[PDB]
Symmetry: C3
Subunit: 102 residues, 3 copies
């Protein structure tokens, strides 16, 4: 399995994008939590409030999922970061395989 | 070293499981923080509040630690995700080797 | 690209260290968020409040960045953890390459 981390403008879209993704079964689970973003943006170091999301799904889905977020994200260019999981416990991953579209 | 991410029902058990783990010296450090879980559960997309935990220990401990959490987790099937650390600074990891059971 | 996770005593230094890093262009973006630390410290299992940071930059920068944090961190021995990103979307990483010193 893998972890996909992306950030959102506000809770609205995060929940919207995330529930859409679960419905479509692109991911099994999501963990959202706010955080303060400090980043280089066009003419200045900006600081705003964001809603980061931790999506968890199948490695084979990485491609189509990345595609799907591009299409759903409020941001013209989302951060879609994939971090592979080197190991996971025996039940969970069976629960995740079942929960994601085939 | 590696990172082990697991989620809890509430702060009660998170602290209970986490302090138990440190005592037993299964991990050197833990970082807990709440997050909103959106996941596929039996008959519906549920949404609740959770307490995610970031455990940090030795790679050789991964096996026994996974075992230990299964035995301690409130959840009948915990998410026990291992993410290997590709590199870490020189002091910290010595501090972590010392802090974990031999 | 890679992820560098480090923790801070309070928001003061986190923002100070993080903005310094962006200015110097050592990293493109940072996401800070508080968390409760439970860790083995000298004579006891301590529990305090921390400000964890997720720094995102180039893998080639890992070395100099680790060096730089050691020099900037309030902590005599920071946790500087590097987690490589196995994949990232096509725009973002171009935006990150541009945002980091050459």
């Amino acid at each position: 399995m893998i972890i996909v981390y992306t950030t959102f403008p506000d809770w609205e879209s995060a929940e919207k994008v995330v529930k859409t993704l679960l419905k479509e079964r692109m991911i099994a689970c999501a963990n959202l939590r706010e955080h303060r973003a400090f980043y280089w943006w066009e003419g200045k170091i900006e600081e705003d409030k964001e809603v980061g999301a931790i999506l968890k799904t199948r490695e084979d889905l990485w491609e189509e999922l990345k595609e799907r977020i591009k299409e759903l994200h409020p941001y013209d260019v989302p951060a879609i970061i994939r971090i592979d999981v080197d190991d996971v416990n025996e039940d969970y991953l069976k629960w995740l395989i079942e929960e994601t579209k085939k």
